[PDB]
Amino acid sequence: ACGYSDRVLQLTLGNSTITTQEAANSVVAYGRWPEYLRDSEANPVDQPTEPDVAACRFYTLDTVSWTKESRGWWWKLPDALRDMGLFGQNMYYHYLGRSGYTVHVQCNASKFHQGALGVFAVPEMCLAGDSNTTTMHTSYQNANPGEKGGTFTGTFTPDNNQTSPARRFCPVDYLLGNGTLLGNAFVFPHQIINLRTNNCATLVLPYVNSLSIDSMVKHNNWGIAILPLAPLNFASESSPEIPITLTIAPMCCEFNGLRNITLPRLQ
Amino acid sequence: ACGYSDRVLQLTLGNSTITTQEAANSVVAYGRWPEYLRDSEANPVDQPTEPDVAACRFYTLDTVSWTKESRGWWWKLPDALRDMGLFGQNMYYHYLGRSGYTVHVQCNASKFHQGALGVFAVPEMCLAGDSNTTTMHTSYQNANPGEKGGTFTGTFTPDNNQTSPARRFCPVDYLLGNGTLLGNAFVFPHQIINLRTNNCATLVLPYVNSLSIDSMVKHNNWGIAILPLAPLNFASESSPEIPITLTIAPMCCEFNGLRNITLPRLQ
Amino acid sequence: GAQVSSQKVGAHENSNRAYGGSTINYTTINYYRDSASNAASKQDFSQDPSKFTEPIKDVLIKTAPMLN
Amino acid sequence: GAQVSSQKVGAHENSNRAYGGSTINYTTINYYRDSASNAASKQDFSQDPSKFTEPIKDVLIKTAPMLN
Amino acid sequence: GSSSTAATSRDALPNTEASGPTHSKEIPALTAVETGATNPLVPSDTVQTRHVVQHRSRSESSIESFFARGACVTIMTVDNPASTTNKDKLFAVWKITYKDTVQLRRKLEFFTYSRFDMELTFVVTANFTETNNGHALNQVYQIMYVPPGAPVPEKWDDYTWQTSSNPSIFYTYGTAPARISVPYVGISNAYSHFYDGFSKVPLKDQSAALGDSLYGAASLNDFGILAVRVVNDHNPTKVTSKIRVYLKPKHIRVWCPRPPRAVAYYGPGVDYKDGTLTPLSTKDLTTY
Amino acid sequence: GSSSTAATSRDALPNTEASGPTHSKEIPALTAVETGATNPLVPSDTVQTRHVVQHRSRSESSIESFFARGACVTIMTVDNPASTTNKDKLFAVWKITYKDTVQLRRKLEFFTYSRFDMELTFVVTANFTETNNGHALNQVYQIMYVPPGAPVPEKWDDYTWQTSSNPSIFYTYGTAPARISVPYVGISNAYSHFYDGFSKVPLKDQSAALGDSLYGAASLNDFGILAVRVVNDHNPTKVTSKIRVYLKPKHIRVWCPRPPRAVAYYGPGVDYKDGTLTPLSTKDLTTY
Ligand SMILES: CCCCCCCCCCCCCCCC(=O)O
Ligand SMILES: CCCCCCCCCCCCCCCC(=O)O
Ligand SMILES: *C(=O)CCCCCCCCCCCCC
Ligand SMILES: *C(=O)CCCCCCCCCCCCC
């Protein structure tokens, strides 16, 4: 009647707005919109900080590039937003924090391009390490890349330097980087950016954890995994490239246990 | 509101379903949906066989190829379905039969192709023969090609072998293969597959005859004629080709006068 | 303090004055104060799978185009 | 949730203020949720043998000629 | 006195409704999986169907029923040797976990989080080892739960086996397997099957060694240990014994489904090992 | 609270009625067995009778009562040898069936189809075999049901004995025989005692080998296997054991009566063997 459509959306949070004209509806993970911590589930007793529009707004991370050789990308939350404006400051000044998110993945191309990205949001996205001599050895620094994220690989390559081990993840793409088959990742909240259909993915994520609130600096609640289910192609070019951009807004974030700021060892 | 559309249809008969996303509505010939024979119009008194889903389902015939030199194609009904599953068996085991049909012609291409097919359903589609020395001489075998159908030609070529005459049709395209001008074939139930607009034609055909029921093995009730009203073209290629596929479902078919099976001379 | 519940009978004996038919019940009495000590009742609930099969914000009407 | 049923008494003790006479009953309580776990009740039904002994379409009257 | 007993696990699934031919703009068959939704079709959406009164139910695939089994989670070895042995009498210490074996672990790991009461059952077997004819009298075993912080036994007979506060089971050989229940004892609102994090934040101002910890590990799952001994004094003929521990999660709830483990387990985390990464076998695309 | 309890199995049969002399066109005695019917006569139809109050009943020949007995359907052998043996420790694998023995099989085969809950009882016995004086401690046995598709154990101690999902019974030697019940588990609406058909249609367009299958066989009756082991580790004195399995069909219904097996069984089908086809003995026609 007025022409409203699944494909055309506007999202506004704080001082930020996203528009899209080629959406494929949007997902609310497990049917649960983000929410503040109810009194009946509360646990730290101090009055929480709730930054509201100062932190619940769209932050855009560094753009990456999709090519025919890309195996996939991953980020962790809250880690990818640790250095984002007042969200990052509130996270590091407090022992505890909780937050939900709107995740908007952006990737446009043309009616002559093809390819499809699976965009998965995974609760507790534990990834496999690079070692066959020690388990659970990925270091804090390598497990937490911040906004640059990390990547998947098509080949497991064990680290053989036992003198100074690399201590990083070696996440194999068809094993979802965690020992399970990628074809089943669709039981996690997801969308697919299939270039002939849509140019974005939107996932609204509730805070998920076995606790009401926890250490954001120690623990990532959600992982975002983006993998090419169908490879990028274009006209008859051998090396096409198109960018992928992530923009994420915290939602209903609240924090407890205020003290001096955490200054983490990140390199 | 929900986005329902003329162009997007689903047809389901028996265990078969057709979908289309570029339809141009669909035609019900002479406004009459197929029906079983009413008691007030009945004639053989034996209890009829009505195969229902065993025969009233979509059968796909062998695909043909449209090129710049194609003059057109024709099929007859029930003949084109004579060897199709239980429809064919019920037809040959009974003296009498009647049936309506859903005819779905399929031909997709691209936004850079052009061309237009007239798809006509003709009651009693009598075609002209190849002879200028004998009339009404096309043989049963040549008049009934089965699912491969036959073709139209742009040139009348009289058979001059009077020793062993070919005895086949010589159907000239602009004379609709029957001595009348093709420009007037639109008074028959029809659709046009014009590649910029639609990729299919759907014709629902009632049983039409001067009798309530008749010999399917002797007599075809309907002809399907497909002719290029505008020739196939593409980019600047000299020899484009695109396939045309026919899928036809019998509807409300019923049969009388059961006996041993008819074994016809078809070659 | 007995709990009496009904059984879902699968194979029925030739009997309706004792077994197969006139609803066969069973009895449970908890012997311990701690509920962790209890047996499992197996009287469990089902739910709609939608939070996993249809987690989209705008309702899916299956007869309609998903994208519109 | 006890089931009380009667016994068919065969040998009766010299007693009618306790055993033999004033209907002797017995008690059953099912302890399991699965009915396959139940004992057999043995309270079973009989039927007419006609589906095997007289499966003829037209009724047999024994005093009459079978063929007529 | 007597208590007597909305879709339940044992309810019949929906009937199939009869449906006939169709020709319309309704398009159930066409869909768009990019949205993240699965198309909710039933057969009457794409074929003609008859009416069928459905009697099947999903009673055996409820979470409770999928998990209603004891699974072996460890084998503990103990012995009772002669007093003249150079070797110490063996008592066993096992850090409680479902990750030392693989079958229950894989089933629980279809989910991210769970809550349950735990039933533990103990099967105890014994045998002679020296080709001797000497005998032994029936053994009694002490299975002591030593929760985190309590003193772990260092000798089969030290003071810790007094168990004034730890729960202990004294099991008699040859009797019915021992069994206890435990409540949901997690320090969180649910057990975490996966913890994407660390127990320590490494600080810039501190040495790397001081801020280091294992990936994916936390006391979320430190439940302490079982310590087991043969209570009988040393005997001249040595007897060795094994205690098999079976875990059944009862009264269970689970959250956030996951793809199941597809390559062999490799330690208590999600790590995998080279040479085990090829679960699928060969099959040609157009071969049935 | 308390529930308290149309021809039943224990009802008295019909009384004999008194009947006197007769002279008429009524002809009960004459009949025609060509019709396929049995003549429904009682004694008062052909002789003079007195009145008799009948007290006998058919209570013990109801289907339930005819089958209310455990019957041995197999004997499984297992052992627990020294660790120094060249021979592997024997665990047993038995494909579940009532056709390895003959008595229950013949009774069930009075019928074409049946439905029942199954009660299985297990009697376990053990003995020494080497004339040695060495001893063994009381054994525990694991009886694991491995349903079709689950991994069958290849060694007495491999991972499959974890039983996270298969049901297992751990039986202790010297205690009451083990016992479980199973529901009617058939993939059909009744168990088929006879299946006149094949599991494969041989197709013209396919090799004969590819379309071949055994006559009368189908997964209608594939119920999987029981796998049994001695759980105790190897002992210096070898002990051998036997597990006898008894099957009682309870809560039973049966359909389509058949002539009983009259010549010796010969495999799991109806085949017979040369030399066994003469069940009847000699008796002269006019000799009482
Ligand atoms: C005498 C016996 C005492 C038994 C003591 C049981 C102690 C608690 C064990 C908790 C088991 C936890 C299973 C889930 C573990 C997880 O979080 O991954
Ligand atoms: C731990 C013990 C488990 C026992 C498992 C019992 C498995 C089902 C057995 C079905 C018995 C079928 C008897 C009739 C067979 C037939 O169809 O001929
Ligand atoms: C409800 O519990 C009252 C009905 C009591 C029925 C008999 C109880 C059977 C024995 C239970 C003993 C106590 C268990 C610790
Ligand atoms: C009906 O069941 C109520 C009357 C209860 C009578 C006493 C029950 C005896 C003990 C049964 C225990 C529960 C068995 C699992």
Side-chain angles (χ1 to χ4, degrees), chain C residues 1-2 29-32, chain E residues 1-2:
Chain C
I29 291 173
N30 291 146
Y31 312 123
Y32 299 92
Chain E
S2 298

PDB file of all heavy atoms in Angstrom, chain C residues 1-2 29-32, chain E residues 1-2, ligand 3:
ATOM      1  N   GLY C   1       1.367 -39.440  50.978  1.00  0.00           N
ATOM      2  CA  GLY C   1       1.559 -38.363  49.966  1.00  0.00           C
ATOM      3  C   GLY C   1       1.897 -38.884  48.540  1.00  0.00           C
ATOM      4  O   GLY C   1       2.878 -38.533  47.849  1.00  0.00           O
ATOM      5  N   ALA C   2       1.044 -39.785  48.077  1.00  0.00           N
ATOM      6  CA  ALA C   2       1.279 -40.459  46.826  1.00  0.00           C
ATOM      7  C   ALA C   2       0.882 -39.689  45.583  1.00  0.00           C
ATOM      8  O   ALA C   2      -0.129 -38.988  45.524  1.00  0.00           O
ATOM      9  CB  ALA C   2       0.528 -41.765  46.829  1.00  0.00           C
ATOM     10  N   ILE C  29       5.931 -42.284  45.292  1.00  0.00           N
ATOM     11  CA  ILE C  29       6.062 -41.629  46.591  1.00  0.00           C
ATOM     12  C   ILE C  29       7.526 -41.245  46.753  1.00  0.00           C
ATOM     13  O   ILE C  29       8.417 -42.104  46.624  1.00  0.00           O
ATOM     14  CB  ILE C  29       5.666 -42.580  47.708  1.00  0.00           C
ATOM     15  CG1 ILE C  29       4.182 -42.826  47.644  1.00  0.00           C
ATOM     16  CG2 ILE C  29       6.039 -42.001  49.058  1.00  0.00           C
ATOM     17  CD1 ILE C  29       3.757 -43.918  48.648  1.00  0.00           C
ATOM     18  N   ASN C  30       7.815 -39.980  47.009  1.00  0.00           N
ATOM     19  CA  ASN C  30       9.198 -39.590  47.239  1.00  0.00           C
ATOM     20  C   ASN C  30       9.655 -39.897  48.642  1.00  0.00           C
ATOM     21  O   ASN C  30       8.959 -39.607  49.603  1.00  0.00           O
ATOM     22  CB  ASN C  30       9.406 -38.145  47.043  1.00  0.00           C
ATOM     23  CG  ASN C  30       9.262 -37.781  45.584  1.00  0.00           C
ATOM     24  OD1 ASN C  30       8.792 -36.716  45.218  1.00  0.00           O
ATOM     25  ND2 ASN C  30       9.628 -38.579  44.606  1.00  0.00           N
ATOM     26  N   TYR C  31      10.797 -40.521  48.784  1.00  0.00           N
ATOM     27  CA  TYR C  31      11.262 -40.907  50.095  1.00  0.00           C
ATOM     28  C   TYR C  31      12.254 -39.933  50.692  1.00  0.00           C
ATOM     29  O   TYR C  31      12.605 -40.051  51.859  1.00  0.00           O
ATOM     30  CB  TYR C  31      11.915 -42.263  50.021  1.00  0.00           C
ATOM     31  CG  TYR C  31      11.079 -43.280  49.277  1.00  0.00           C
ATOM     32  CD1 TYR C  31      11.610 -43.931  48.170  1.00  0.00           C
ATOM     33  CD2 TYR C  31       9.793 -43.570  49.718  1.00  0.00           C
ATOM     34  CE1 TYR C  31      10.848 -44.864  47.484  1.00  0.00           C
ATOM     35  CE2 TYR C  31       9.025 -44.500  49.044  1.00  0.00           C
ATOM     36  CZ  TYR C  31       9.568 -45.144  47.940  1.00  0.00           C
ATOM     37  OH  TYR C  31       8.805 -46.051  47.276  1.00  0.00           O
ATOM     38  N   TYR C  32      12.715 -38.937  49.950  1.00  0.00           N
ATOM     39  CA  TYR C  32      13.761 -38.073  50.451  1.00  0.00           C
ATOM     40  C   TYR C  32      13.416 -36.606  50.513  1.00  0.00           C
ATOM     41  O   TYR C  32      12.658 -36.088  49.704  1.00  0.00           O
ATOM     42  CB  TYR C  32      14.996 -38.213  49.593  1.00  0.00           C
ATOM     43  CG  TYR C  32      15.567 -39.610  49.576  1.00  0.00           C
ATOM     44  CD1 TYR C  32      15.201 -40.539  48.603  1.00  0.00           C
ATOM     45  CD2 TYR C  32      16.489 -39.945  50.553  1.00  0.00           C
ATOM     46  CE1 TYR C  32      15.775 -41.815  48.609  1.00  0.00           C
ATOM     47  CE2 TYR C  32      17.063 -41.209  50.571  1.00  0.00           C
ATOM     48  CZ  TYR C  32      16.706 -42.127  49.600  1.00  0.00           C
ATOM     49  OH  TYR C  32      17.319 -43.340  49.640  1.00  0.00           O
TER      50      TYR C  32
ATOM     51  N   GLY E   1      -2.291 -36.763  50.839  1.00  0.00           N
ATOM     52  CA  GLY E   1      -2.812 -38.121  50.647  1.00  0.00           C
ATOM     53  C   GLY E   1      -2.485 -38.733  49.276  1.00  0.00           C
ATOM     54  O   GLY E   1      -1.568 -39.550  49.126  1.00  0.00           O
ATOM     55  N   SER E   2      -3.243 -38.337  48.257  1.00  0.00           N
ATOM     56  CA  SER E   2      -3.004 -38.812  46.894  1.00  0.00           C
ATOM     57  C   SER E   2      -3.230 -37.739  45.851  1.00  0.00           C
ATOM     58  O   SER E   2      -4.368 -37.316  45.613  1.00  0.00           O
ATOM     59  CB  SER E   2      -3.917 -39.970  46.487  1.00  0.00           C
ATOM     60  OG  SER E   2      -3.682 -41.100  47.321  1.00  0.00           O
TER      61      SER E   2
HETATM   62  C1  LIG G   3       1.547 -39.849  51.453  1.00  0.00           C
HETATM   63  O1  LIG G   3       2.748 -39.944  51.440  1.00  0.00           O
HETATM   64  C2  LIG G   3       0.668 -40.580  52.431  1.00  0.00           C
HETATM   65  C3  LIG G   3       0.264 -42.061  51.978  1.00  0.00           C
HETATM   66  C4  LIG G   3       1.313 -42.902  52.649  1.00  0.00           C
HETATM   67  C5  LIG G   3       1.275 -44.190  51.888  1.00  0.00           C
HETATM   68  C6  LIG G   3       2.269 -45.218  52.416  1.00  0.00           C
HETATM   69  C7  LIG G   3       3.717 -44.730  52.444  1.00  0.00           C
HETATM   70  C8  LIG G   3       4.653 -45.900  52.102  1.00  0.00           C
HETATM   71  C9  LIG G   3       5.953 -45.841  52.901  1.00  0.00           C
HETATM   72  C10 LIG G   3       6.716 -44.510  52.763  1.00  0.00           C
HETATM   73  C11 LIG G   3       7.711 -44.460  53.924  1.00  0.00           C
HETATM   74  C12 LIG G   3       8.437 -43.138  54.162  1.00  0.00           C
HETATM   75  C13 LIG G   3       9.613 -42.993  53.209  1.00  0.00           C
HETATM   76  C14 LIG G   3      10.778 -42.208  53.860  1.00  0.00           C
END
